[PDB]
Amino acid sequence: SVRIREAKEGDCGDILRLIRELAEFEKLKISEEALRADGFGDNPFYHCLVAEILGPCVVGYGIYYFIYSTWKGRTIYLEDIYVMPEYRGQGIGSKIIKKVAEVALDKGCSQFRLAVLDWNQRAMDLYKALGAQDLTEAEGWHFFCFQGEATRKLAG
Amino acid sequence: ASVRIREAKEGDCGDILRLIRELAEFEKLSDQVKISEEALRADGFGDNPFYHCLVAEICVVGYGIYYFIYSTWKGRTIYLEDIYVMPEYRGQGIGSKIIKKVAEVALDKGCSQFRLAVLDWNQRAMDLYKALGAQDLTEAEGWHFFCFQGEATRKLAGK
Ligand SMILES: CC(=O)SCCNC(=O)CCNC(=O)[C@H](O)C(C)(C)COP(=O)(O)OP(=O)(O)OC[C@H]1O[C@@H](n2cnc3c(N)ncnc32)[C@H](O)[C@@H]1OP(=O)(O)O
């Protein structure tokens, strides 16, 4: 059986290995020391769940953080989304999504956001199934980003 | 017009919400306004705020609302979530002046990663931000802004 639970400092080794998996999947910094140094400390800027089979081992993760929307109020942003290849399509990806849903309400967040890769069609179809809205296509939102000098200039 | 940009104080929440409502009312999307004045005060003027707000004051006629994130591609980052300037003050460069400050906040914090989203109709801001060093993300990388709103949320939580 599988259980989606909040992560503990003890899972930071597995989480680091899963961060290097998902990104390799998405194609393009944070050592274990970094994970504990912020993800738990006392002033966490981000938290997460660790899909764990019950020998008991970490088989995927979901990390999120609290952001803000001017239409509803307390929002939740679900960043990284990844399940081990052998363990996909068997309900785990959704259980992580549902858990993020529970945390949202429990924390006064009625809605939740996230970004998605265009070629990553399967996931998009997953999110749409569970009720998500592709605001990029349903409204026209175009993510935009500055890096280094670009931000320096923007700042005037 | 004689205007200054400044950090919002809990007392600016009434004007911030009034402005948010004026916008939504303009787009005929009022019914989508679920935020509250009490939430604006609490969600950012207590323990650990969900957002930060800069207001353009002459009478508050505009605002900028941001906060930081924690993705996984480049680490911490400042993110602009919304900017509004009353119609009577458009063309004055206030919104342009507000964004510059949000960028200065990031740099002042030691962060050079600045993110945001742009509306599809905007044909100047985009090509402009590019001439600055930025790059649209949805037209290129294929990044799509997905949103699980209220109906889907509760349903997922089990309700
Ligand atoms: C915000 C983001 O971070 S988006 C990044 C998402 N991550 C990735 O693409 C990395 C590689 N893939 C994965 O990690 C997983 O395949 C996930 C997270 C996308 C989906 O988790 P899964 O456990 O495979 O999906 P789960 O079984 O819970 O499926 C729920 C729905 O998604 C669909 N789905 C999405 N991806 C897959 C997949 N790779 N294999 C099988 N089904 C998939 C299912 O068919 C199901 O849809 P349906 O009800 O219409 O049939």
Task: Give every CB contact of residue A65 below 8 A, 6+ residues apart in sequence.
Answer: A45, A46, A47, A76, A77, A79, B69, B70
Order of strands, sheet of B4-7, starting from the edge strand that comes earlier in the sequence: B4-7, B52-57, B60-70, B76-85, B113-119, A141-147, B135-136
> B1: Cβ–Cβ under 8 A, 6 or more apart, which residues?
B58, B89, B92
DSSP A7: -
Instruction: Say if residue A110 carries a ligand binding annotation.
Output: no
Please, which experimental method was used?
X-ray
H-run or E-run covering B114: strand B113-119
- Paired strand residues for A155: none
Q: Please give the number of the atom of ligand 1 that sits closest to the Cα of A22.
A: 10
How far is B64 from B53, CA to CA, in rounded Å? 6
Ranges of each domain in chain A: 1-156
Q: A61 catalytic, yes or no?
A: no
CA dihedral sign of residues A90, A95, A7, A16: positive
Architecture of domain B1-159: 3-Layer(aba) Sandwich (3.40)
Name which of B73, B121, B132 is nearest A146 (Cβ-Cβ). B132
What HEC string does A105-126 produce? HHCCCCEEEEEECCCCHHHHHH
Residue B88 annotated as lining a ligand binding site: no
Instruction: Test A132 with B148 for CB contact under 8 angstroms.
Output: yes
Q: Which CATH superfamily is domain A1-156 in?
A: Gcn5-related N-acetyltransferase (GNAT) (3.40.630.30)
Burial call A3-28: b when 16+ CB within 10 Å, e when fewer: ebeebeeebbebbbebbebbeeeeee
Burial of A90 (0-12, 13-18, 19+ CB in 10 A): exposed
Resolution of the solved structure (Å): 1.8
CB A72 within 8 A of CB A110: yes
Question: In the structure encoding, which two tokens stand for residue A88, read together?
Answer: 């996909």
Q: Which two tokens stand for residue A153?
A: 């200039």
